[PDB]
């Protein structure tokens, strides 16, 4: 049971603020020598939140595999003698184990979701405790995402993985201590139903030794509904709906009264209905059309570290270009992202970190498990770890009205028997963990309409298609034919709504061509344009998401010229020519509505 | 009187949690309608700290001149009923006025220094107060740095100024709320002396409480102790940078307050052709810098500081100049705490009307331009810099201004009071004023009111363009001319050439990486031949944003690094020189 921290009977002191002591451990003696005991040797200042790889311009820190130590002292605020205090890590990429002054208090696997522990017994209010963090950036076959650690003859660990983006690690987001009353709200769940768009209710179901009443206050803070019951309610309402263009928010505030002290938790709600009918995706009983991007949490110097200016600027760009939706590509994003999405009515495809369950999308000319689904590779523990990743993503983003669909994985290889054996239970478990949202699994190119094995276990079909790029390279005529043929094949086979969640081409900013050859800005424009002409001719396609909003870092190889260049913007957010192409189509269309051509 | 908040009896909650409501005021009715009354509407989220220009990819926000509105609520923590609580803005670039629920708690002019006010009478602990800030980015002749606003025919403002870097504005740094005990230290002053194995550290810990001071070590084990005033003997170097800690106890019987403040034991002084740190002949190596970065403008960011310091350490720089304004206080904590030599400078740039582009007041020193009010604001800006960076050991010299025009009559009236007054505002640090190329040896009027004079020279770039043999001859002859003409130590605070990353040439044509390399090598060979100059700082460390014009290809491109911090070929050239010399000792 987890909620995002906020105010009044609750209060934060964040240690996000500032520089920590940081150290490597090339021989992994930190645990043996109990480094959490003393203040570190060999410590250098590092900034949190932020990846550790790019911060020191050193290829050895950058390419490190192992454990790293983050440590900082802090003064525990003194008006906190009688309240309950928690230590919350909003993300520690891959694995983290924390000591609060010689006392292990938490441990976590999963680099993208928050994890907290009550630390009341282990701290002296009014004085300073020392926080030590042990961070592991290693991936094996039971981590979400999977990878393999390669140890050379000399014990240097080098991490290989099967996804594009670079394996940035560290404390990527918020680290804070926050206090709730000893009687406190611990979890909230809100569900919205709507009929003729002027007439429904907000079911609730709450959970910590406190009798609870909930007021549903206005944007004007005018109250229009009231309930009581730990097992919640159905507050019935005639309302203004949370819509894609505007995203209205009521405020449902839950009051947890114990007979002495009280706690109250403010939770914003968007009144909207999501469903799939035939080949139509409907938000509030109207067929929506998705436009926008796959994104990444990547940026210069800070890696995957959260940054407010970046969020403000990237939403300004996305707003300008006319995007209405995005997918949290290949891991759960910072919650600040989803909060922004709620206030602005941005439609979001929420996705777990389950990427790389595929051993066919390689560079060439170089020792893998020859069976993807097996005891050596993706096995039962992997499945359990995956289900737990689904449970953490859902427990954190269930109430967000902007999250409109759950993505279980991205681009697994579905051809082997055992893909369906691995995925079907996860598809079912996910539906039972949130029956109010449709479910998806993003589908790779070579698992075509004929060969794919699991897409009928999901509500929406999300395709990643690169005809004319990785195959039929340079050939816009042939690729157009292939793309039309496979889209009609998919619509014939499943009669589900189709979103093209990935389509894009590597483009060097400033490379121009009078031909329309690959890597050129002219080719990025003509290729996106040919895709758009096809989408507009297939009734089932309800959504387009250009593969990347910006250029991002990847591991080194012959396929990646300083990373992935499929961005519409450069890594410093400057637009390639295709940006204006996109802006013309996406602002020239009626909002949320499929282009009539 | 100023110092940075810390936490043992005092406590901060920073409102730097960035997202504030933000709005323009294009018809300038915000003050009239008292927008601080209600929450701003027609408001959009903005990140604090950070400049407001570049955050929104909007050219109308970017080039705006006027007032902008920043607003955020905060819940004042309830364990704060009896202490004194202050609202601290570490910097609001150019002008700021704060309302804490209607009570206009402050004002500040001067965009690079902090300003704080006690807000206890106007705050109820346990609930949220509404914070409204009005920041103005406009410049006149009475501002630091100076500028002129011209209004076109339709009431549209265009802000013109005379310094290179772009006029970024907004809440550039920390906004923190911090609570002290009701008898509290308000200021600290420390001075260190050292002889040629032993010496003393004066203090003056201006507070309502008796004073006791502990000098704890890095072990925080005691080495001297006192009880306003001291002078203590003992029994901080560039490569290493040690720091002791004096802890101040303001002892009262009603309540107690304590302040921890770091100190560096080192001595700086000049004569002959030598600048000596702890009685040792220094050589400055390093950079002119800027607080500039993508999307955030001049906004402070910790990752940027960690990365840029990794870069300067790798390349072999031991020093930098806080070019054209006072930097982040955290900059100087890093420099003290890492032993970086810092030439500290105020925001006195653009006092010159002579090298703009081609294609205005007709005398610079007069009431129309540089007037008496300008004298006041300049003196006050010098004094705010002095009050905030007085205790920092890394500061090794103070820069009163950068690149004024000294040729018009009257420069010496404006300047003499500021040099006398500033020397009188700290005799423990030497003073300089950076002078432009065209005020050469024969022409310059004021180089003798300062302890060291710092030259910005660009021969072979703006003059003798491409002519590197001829430029060599000029640089050598006027360098020797300066050495004979004042026999002061000389630091070269600026030398660099615009270099487009990826432009390469089999000739050595301007704007090319080969040209930057060849030009820097020729300059370096030139200095190796003048006993007098004790400091080299390549002009800019990274490419930075400027206002638009035919001289600036998407900004200034003189950086050794690009704006995304990638090295040009010259970066390695510099590394070879600065790694190949013995530390602090020039060939
Ligand atoms: C032949 C199949 C090619 C799949 C390649 C498409 C990949 N999908 C996942 C994304 O994270 C990658 O960046 C994308 C790519 O490589 O740019
Ligand atoms: C004839 C030109 C005289 C030198 C003027 C050179 C200028 N000095 C001041 C710095 O702020 C500028 O960045 C520098 C430049 O080039 O960008």
Numbering used by the authors:
A (entry chain A): 0 to 206, 208 to 366, 369 to 599
B (entry chain B): 0 to 195, 197 to 207, 209 to 228, 231 to 238, 242 to 365, 370 to 597
What text comes from the article?
Though less potent for LgGUS and BdGUS, 4 still inhibited these two GUSs in the sub-micromolar range (Ki = 270 and 440 nM, respectively) and was selective for the two bacterial GUSs (390- and 240-fold more potent than for HsGUS, respectively). Likewise, C6-hexyl UIFG also was 1770-fold more potent for inhibiting EcGUS than HsGUS. Furthermore, EcGUS contains a narrower aglycone-binding site than LgGUS and BdGUS. Taking the comparison between EcGUS and HsGUS as an example, the aglycone-binding site of EcGUS is surrounded by five hydrophobic residues, namely Phe365, Leu361, Val446, Met447, and Phe448, which are located in loops 3 and 5, whereas the site of HsGUS is surrounded by Ser485loop 5, Tyr505loop 6, His509loop 6, and Thr599loop 8. Interestingly, owing to the longer alkyl chains of 3 and 4, Phe448 rotated outward in EcGUS/3 and EcGUS/4 and thus increased the hydrophobic contact area. Similar to the previous trend, the entropy contribution of 3 and 4 increased with the length of alkyl chain (–TΔΔS2–3 = –1.32 kcal mol−1 and –TΔΔS2–4 = −1.34 kcal mol−1 for EcGUS), while the enthalpy contribution decreased (ΔΔH2–3 = +0.04 kcal mol−1 and ΔΔH2–4 = +0.99 kcal mol−1 for EcGUS).
However, microflora-encoding β-glucuronidases (GUSs) are notorious for reversing the glucuronidation to release SN-38 in the intestinal lumen and thus represent the major cause of undesirable effects. GUS contains a deep enzyme active site (the two catalytic glutamates lie ~12 Å below the protein surface).
